[PDB]
Amino acid sequence: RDTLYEAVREVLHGNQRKRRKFLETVELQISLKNYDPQKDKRFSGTVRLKSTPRPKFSVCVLGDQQHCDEAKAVDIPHMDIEALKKLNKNKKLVKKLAKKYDAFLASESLIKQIPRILGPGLNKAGKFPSLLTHNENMVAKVDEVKSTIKFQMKKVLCLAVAVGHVKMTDDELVYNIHLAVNFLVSLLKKNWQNVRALYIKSTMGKPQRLY
RNA sequence: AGGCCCGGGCCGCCGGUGAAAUACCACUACUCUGAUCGUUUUUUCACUGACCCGGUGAGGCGGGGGGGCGAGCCCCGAGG
Ligand SMILES: [Mg+2]
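Structure tokens for the assembled complex are given below, as produced in the milestone run.
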């Protein structure tokens, strides 16, 4: 506990701020051990955090008549089916969208449009839209949900994701790490056994080596 | 979203492009190399003395000597 998480916290406070002008976002860098990536089940997970957004902005864009109205209401982006279809030109416009929009939403438009009318590419970028809108929620809550941490294992024995903000500093911080490190252990094939090291990195340099 | 200038400096997340990169930072993974007699793990070959087998009334084995009917080679005084 305090032996392990408090010591490293203090390092970030003394270091970091003075080290680099401008503030980035902390990320939890993990290293697996004694695991076979392609010969064994891939563990994919998605969990919430307390009340802090890891991504700075660009929450999501939706596609539906009413959701687009509520979109112009509280959200900057309100794309619609007919506006969305750009065909072959979309390939590059959608690559730009993947570079921009951190996430995407769709009220039943995604079921048919992305495989067909929108096209592929969102999957290639790893960002397919979510059916989080179903005419049964308010998009403010959906935007609060889009500020989470998502896990999927790949060939590299390491998955790194937004775990904190240099600008936001509270005990809650590590409580997000505590939630995150446990969440991997929960969905890992055989628990803590296959974790070689854990790292929390913010901005530039190497500030943490948990376990 | 050039870290990095003397109170005025540049790589690129610019645009393209490829299936994904082109600042900056990390994180691994793998292939190679020296070191650590640090940890163990093993493979081949050879020996004989345990042990095994066969033969025999356990009858001539091993090394050396001596001699050719000797053979190649040497100063040959054509030769101990
Ligand atoms: Mg005999």
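The longest strand of chain A covers residues 195-201. Residues 19-22, 24, 27, 29-32, 37, 92, 99, 124-125, 155-158, 160, 196-197, 199, 201, 203-206 of chain A lie near RNA strand B (CB under 10 Å from a C1'). Further analysis is deferred to the final report.
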